[PDB]
Amino acid sequence: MRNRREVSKLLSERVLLLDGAYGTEFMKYGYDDLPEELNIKAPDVVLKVHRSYIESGSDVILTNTFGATRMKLRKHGLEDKLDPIVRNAVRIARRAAGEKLVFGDIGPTGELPYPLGSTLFEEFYENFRETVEIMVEEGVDGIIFETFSDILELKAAVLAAREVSRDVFLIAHMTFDEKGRSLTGTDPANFAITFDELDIDALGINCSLGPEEILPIFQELSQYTDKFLVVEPNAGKPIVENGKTVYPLKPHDFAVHIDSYYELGVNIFGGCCGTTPEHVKLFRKVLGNRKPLQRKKKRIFAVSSPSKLVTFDHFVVIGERINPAGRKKLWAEMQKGNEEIVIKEAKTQVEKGAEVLDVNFGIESQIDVRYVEKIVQTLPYVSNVPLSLDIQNVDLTERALRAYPGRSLFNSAKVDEEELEMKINLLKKYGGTLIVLLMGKDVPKSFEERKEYFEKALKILERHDFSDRVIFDPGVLPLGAEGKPVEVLKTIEFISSKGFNTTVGLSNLSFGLPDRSYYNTAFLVLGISKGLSSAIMNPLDETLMKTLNATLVILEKKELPRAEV
């Protein structure tokens, strides 16, 4: 009953105020039932608390639906009460809301994504789709995913929501500990980078930390995103007055941070665990009828994993081993569905220095589609490093981009009008970066030719505003096929001059000749000197790795291992 343009037009005009805890407010009225159940067993309390806040000055209240999802309600055997639980909630809230805003509040299922758990991107996606549909029907003024602790789950949630409506105002939230990490690893910047390019309207933090510890965390985020920001700290560092649970921070020692958050560009302020209508009554005062600030997001090219954020601000070793396309061995297994052999090759390369893993599925037509989706999701957790998805088929590309936990590096996309625009789209929808391989109908042979391809891809890239999301691959040829590698170098330089990142299929140079390791090492050094910022290579080639490291030290792009005597 209110689109996202409206809701933004408002947020741009003035900083909004949210509400505090509800569970603890139900506790005060003797109700200890699952808060989401009081929508059926005692709508009065629910209506009361919503009022306690709207009076304290809240401009937006969250529907009493945090645990309102199939997967969660199921743990408390309520899978069947889901429909009315939510509908009442929106209605109960809509009541106290009055003229204010009502946001559907959706919390995390509380299940870990496989392997840390046993849930696949699909189960999550479908889980959140169901509820987000109930709410959108009921006319919520937006939807907010609070306290999420895993980019994969939160990714499913946002995609599901957005699949339901392209007009409802969306808000994604993650919760970090004091170390600045999520449950599975995402730090503020990762989260920020990974989720900014998704069709959500705002990002934010809530719970786990008081207004104090949350301040810097909120800043890291505010720096890597231009979307609206929301924050809802706890009520100070948790303690136990009777061994139970008590939040110290008073309405004054709390409401005094509003200033600090205001300057970091916040748009919506509220409170989590320990916050009461009292606090909000002050927030209303300390805050006032202000107007939001600006900050300009610091641009940065990086891919991510649930736990690691790789920035192309140094040489990025892209592991090449997981490639059944070229290994008749690994392909035989992976086709059979072996997940172990793949998780192993993954772990090995990371140990040796690979910061990103390139994964390809060999003969795409004969590979179990559900296996791809399971591996695509799995690796990032058992390897800790991002993945360079080496798919070719458009259909596999999508089934894979969806399930990938984070911001991926998508391998391949020739400079073909169609393929490009088709790949750009998939990425704009699921997020990610693109490896544009300088070659069209057929392979270019000269530095001149490659430049025409580059020049062309640029036109297409700008045309779709996606030039800030690409790494260029000049295309390497085997020496024993008249490669003329000096032409690829002239290209690496040319692109690196224009301001782009570059990678090469290093092992392409020597296929078909002995002492492959030498030509590779040689080429890499030469390549790096010309600008090459990354290279799908074999981290297991020790000499290549060492010579590489040496090269970087020499070039002042990394530093000393400790001089002796």
- DSSP assignment of 224-236 equals S--SEEEEE--SS
Burial of 151 (0-12, 13-18, 19+ CB in 10 A): buried
234 is in an annotated binding site: yes
207 is in an annotated binding site: yes
Residue among 231, 227, 175 at smallest CA distance from 201: 227
**Phi and psi (nearest 5°) for 318?**
-100, 105
Give the whole-angstrom CA distance, residue 394 versus residue 422. 8
Cis ω on the peptide bond leading into residue 248 (within 30° of 0)? no
Give the whole-angstrom CA distance, residue 321 versus residue 343. 11
273 is in an annotated binding site: yes
393 is in an annotated binding site: no
473 is in an annotated binding site: yes
516 is in an annotated binding site: yes
Q: Where are the beta strands (DSSP E) in 51-125?
A: 60-62, 101-106
The topology (CATH level 3) of 301-565 is: TIM Barrel (3.20.20)
**Phi and psi (nearest 5°) for 21?**
-60, 155
326 is in an annotated binding site: no
The b-or-e profile of 494-522 (16+ CB within 10 A means b, else e) is bbbeeebbbbbbbbbbbeeeeebbebbbe
Joined tokens for residue 431: 């997020």
Domains 1-300 and 301-565 agree in fold: yes
The topology (CATH level 3) of 1-300 is: TIM Barrel (3.20.20)
Residue among 388, 354, 317 at smallest CA distance from 533: 317
Joined tokens for residue 563: 């001089």
362 is in an annotated binding site: no
272 is in an annotated binding site: yes
Residue 445's alpha-carbon distances to 452, 535, 537, in angstroms, are 12, 20, 22
Going from N- to C-terminal start, the domains of the chain cover 1-300, 301-565
Enumerate residues 6+ apart whose C-beta is below 8 A from 403: 120, 121, 122, 152, 373, 376, 377
